[PDB]
Design a protein around this nucleic acid. Structure first.
Lengths: 220, 215
RNA sequence: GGUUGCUCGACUGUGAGGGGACCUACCCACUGUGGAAACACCACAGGAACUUCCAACCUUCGGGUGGCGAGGUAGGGCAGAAGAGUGACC
């Protein structure tokens, strides 16, 4: 199927500020479906947010946002919107978009979700990572250290994604600076060390930062 | 007034091939307007049971919903390992709609000891005045593991931070990265840096270590 | 003067279990299914049950058919009837 939902319009926002999330629909028209926004603070749960009813435009809102958020829809653009005003910290979440299924098929289940956009309400400014290499020493391990960035998220691929297997990228933890630091590691057989180039590709879109750090063995 | 969806347990460890039962209890009647979702880390939620017993299109027969009054229960006959995820009940009998606090499910495999390595701070970093020492506990189970940094045989306290992978659903195992961080000056004040792992798969606390400067 | 017919007719009544089912059009509702559909809009089906009725239709006079939103507006119907006429009789 082509059924797809494409959130966008997220990011870092100062407290008290505003934002208009967008959700483009593919492979179905949203005119015949009920459309809901659902948000998830980090490592917390799913919270229902708003929803708009087909044919009537009747809108319903979770009570923690009522009168600061505003769900809505342009049929023609096959796009659903959510205007957030007077934002606060606890508004921080991934904001997901979901199609309520067709009744004859999936009841009031939400049958198609987007991948969610990330909304980061905080007054602290952006700052991209410094990326340091983790030198290795029949297998041993090597990686990159993605240090002191903000906000989430960053992304690591090794060798432009060519090296997918054996890799563990750890979740960012929160440095008491308030910045995020995390590290990525892959294990490889020790033979390849001399002959195999090992680059980690780090992207931090909030800052428009792209780093590629070649990870080589101990120099001596 | 809002309908409360009160789910339990908060969390569930169980063996592959076990039966796992998650229950949600609606503070009011919600007829059969209850839907169950599987959410793996970082992905969207996926629909499992709509209308409280109706198996969604393409969901494996080992899942099933069950209404009994204001009590809804999602039921896996026999875990597969892929079935690692957080599960949520939802009610859409009335607006505002409402979800359970969720239930985090964990695979259960034999013990695996952690592969351990230690990383001394990169030469670029030490130029910039920072010094981070990284210790890796790789592909192990169960996750309950103790790490201890010792600098020149002194136990450290409150300058390391660790983080863990989720359960590699193929692997059903974990990986940990503990990170000692010092000023460059505090780093140049000591020779030996060590990382002491205590894990159930180890019969003896494994220490990987390095000296400052050794090539 | 009565008495009784006949015609016109102000106007009123259509009355709920020891007792109320007349018709139509719009309006307004309630319930349930279905419409790509939790509300809204639309289509359709229905207003507890037991009774009660026949304003309606058919009748071999045995009976039969069809029929309920106790809402509102309007026009009718069926009933009464101030009142006029107008006969017959006494």
């Amino acid at each position: 199927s082509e059924v797809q939902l494409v959130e966008s319009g997220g990011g870092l926002v100062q407290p008290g500020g505003s934002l208009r999330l967008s959700c483009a629909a593919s492979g179905f028209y949203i005119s015949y479906s009920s459309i809901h926004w659902v948000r998830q603070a980090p490592g917390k749960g799913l919270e229902w947010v708003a929803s708009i009813s087909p044919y009537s435009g009747s809108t319903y809102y979770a009570d923690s946002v009522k009168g600061r958020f505003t769900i809505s829809a342009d049929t023609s653009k096959n796009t659903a919107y959510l205007q957030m005003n007077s934002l606060r910290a606890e508004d921080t979440a991934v904001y997901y978009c979901a199609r309520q299924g067709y009744r004859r098929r999936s009841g009031r289940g939400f049958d198609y979700w987007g991948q969610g956009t990330l909304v980061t309400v905080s007054s602290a400014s952006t700052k991209g990572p410094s990326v340091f290499p983790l030198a290795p020493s029949g297998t041993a391990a090597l990686g990159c250290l993605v240090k002191d960035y903000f906000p989430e998220p960053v992304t690591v691929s090794w060798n432009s994604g060519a090296l997918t297997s054996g890799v563990h990228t750890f979740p960012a933890v929160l440095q008491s600076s308030g910045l995020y630091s995390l590290s990525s590691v892959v294990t490889v057989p020790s033979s390849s060390l001399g002959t195999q180039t090992y680059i980690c590709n780090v992207n931090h879109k909030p800052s428009n930062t792209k780093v590629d750090k070649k990870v080589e063995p101990k120099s001596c | 007034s809002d309908i409360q969806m009160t789910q339990s347990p908060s969390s569930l460890s169980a063996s592959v091939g076990d039966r796992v039962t998650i229950t949600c209890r609606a503070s009011q009647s919600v007829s059969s307007a209850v839907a169950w979702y599987q959410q793996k880390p970082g992905k969207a939620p996926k629909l499992l049971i709509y209308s409280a017993s109706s198996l969604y299109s393409g969901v494996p027969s080992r899942f099933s919903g069950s209404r009994s009054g204001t009590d809804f229960t999602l039921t896996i006959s026999s875990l597969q390992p892929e079935d690692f995820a957080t599960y949520y009940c939802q009610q859409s009998y009335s607006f505002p709609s409402t979800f359970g606090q969720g239930t985090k499910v964990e695979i259960k495999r034999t013990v695996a000891a952690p592969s351990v390595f230690i990383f001394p701070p990169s030469d670029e970093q030490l130029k910039s005045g920072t010094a981070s020492v990284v210790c890796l506990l790789n592909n192990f189970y169960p996750r309950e593991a103790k790490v201890q940094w010792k600098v020149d045989n002194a136990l450290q306290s409150g300058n390391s931070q660790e983080s863990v992978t989720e359960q590699d659903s193929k692997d059903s195992t974990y990986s940990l990265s503990s990170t000692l961080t010092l000023s460059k000056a505090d780093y140049e004040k000591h020779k030996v840096y060590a990382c002491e792992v205590t894990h159930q798969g180890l019969s003896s606390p494994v220490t990987k270590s390095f000296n400052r400067g050794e090539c």
